[PDB]
From Swiss-Prot:
Family: Belongs to the protein-tyrosine phosphatase family. Non-receptor class 1 subfamily.
Effect of D184A: Substrate-trapping mutant
E.C. number: 3.1.3.48
Tissue expression as described in the entry: Expressed in keratinocytes (at protein level).
The name this protein goes by in its record: Tyrosine-protein phosphatase non-receptor type 1
List of residues that carry Cysteine persulfide: C218
Changes after translation: Oxidized on Cys-218; the Cys-SOH formed in response to redox signaling reacts with the alpha-amido of the following residue to form a sulfenamide cross-link, triggering a conformational change that inhibits substrate binding and activity. The active site can be restored by reduction. Ser-53 is the major site of phosphorylation as compared to Ser-245 and Ser-246. Activated by phosphorylation at Ser-53.
Binding site for substrate: D184, C218, S219, A220, G221, I222, G223, R224, Q265
A single GO molecular function term of this UniProt record: receptor tyrosine kinase binding
Modification Phosphotyrosine occurs at: Y23, Y69
Span within the parent record: 1 to 280 of 435
Cross-link (N,N-(cysteine-1,S-diyl)serine (Cys-Ser)): C218-S219
Length: 283
């Protein structure tokens, strides 16, 4: 019943053509916090986009002795009982930092929402190994990463990776959930594949409470990644709440934007998030 209620509002926004107005209201209401660390001169080459930075209060800090900076934010959705690390696609010089973050934060799942190249432009470095016999060694952070197997499906691929801390020789299995079919322009026409992908992430065990937060990225870590986090958080809230129809997607998005700027980068992404929540509410 909460799906039919939200669907009638959705149809009202469609008929009004008010998606852009609602979206601009969100942009205007969104939190503004300092990002002084991200903007230090020494961090210039650690940011893929000069206009997308983590706030100081929620940034993930690396623990090794150097420079603690990575373009990544901890989004703690307390009522939904889930935290997420949203991060940019790693750069050629930050793939060691990325896996150091995964190790130190105890994450067991990585959700990737882009292809490495799209429309003939690079969105992310090739930060995992494509071939079993060609493992990756990150000499700066002393980590080794091996492809163990992969399950390639028509719309997404799940890879079983082994991440080894070369200092301690401890190994962990990391699952790489790679949504490979987001369209080159716009958003998916239907959220069915997106929701089936989310189900596979949530059923994998990689997001058990015993493990650290899932790491989610796209190219900047705000648009497609914001859509995934927003839909997942809203659907979780529909279980936490006594009345599932009380979940207000705009309010949830504003709460997420306390922890990372720019989440949801277009009105079409906002509409898609509503559509995904409406459909997932049925199930
Ligand atoms: Cl500096
Ligand atoms: Cl709410
Ligand atoms: Cl924005």
């Amino acid at each position: 019943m909460a799906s039919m209620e939200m669907e009638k509002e959705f149809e009202q926004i469609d008929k009004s053509g008010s998606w852009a107005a609602i979206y601009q209201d969100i942009r205007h209401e969104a939190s503004d916090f300092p990002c002084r660390v991200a903007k230090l001169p020494k961090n210039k080459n650690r940011n893929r986009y000069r206009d997308v930075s983590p706030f100081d209060h929620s940034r993930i800090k690396l623990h090794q002795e150097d420079n603690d900076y990575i373009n990544a934010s901890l989004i703690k959705m307390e009522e939904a009982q889930r935290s997420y690390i949203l991060t940019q696609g790693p750069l050629p010089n930050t793939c060691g930092h990325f896996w150091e973050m995964v190790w130190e934060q105890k994450s067991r799942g990585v959700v990737m929402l882009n292809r490495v190249m799209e429309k003939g432009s690079l969105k992310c470095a090739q930060y995992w190994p494509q071939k079993e016999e060609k493992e990756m060694i990150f000499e700066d952070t002393n980590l080794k990463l091996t492809l163990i197997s992969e399950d390639i499906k028509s719309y997404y691929t799940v890879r079983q990776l082994e991440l080894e801390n070369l200092t301690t020789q401890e190994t962990r299995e990391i699952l790489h959930f790679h949504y490979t079919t987001w369209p080159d322009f716009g958003v998916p026409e239907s959220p069915a594949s997106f929701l089936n992908f989310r189900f596979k992430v949530n059923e994998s065990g990689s997001l058990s409470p015993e493990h650290g937060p899932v790491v989610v990225h796209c190219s900047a870590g705000i648009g497609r990644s914001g859509t995934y986090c927003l839909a997942d958080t809203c659907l979780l809230l529909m279980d936490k709440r006594k009345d599932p129809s009380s979940v207000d997607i705009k309010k949830v998005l504003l709460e997420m934007r306390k922890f990372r700027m720019g989440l949801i980068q277009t009105a079409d992404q906002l509409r898609f998030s509503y559509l995904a929540v409406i459909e997932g509410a049925k199930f």
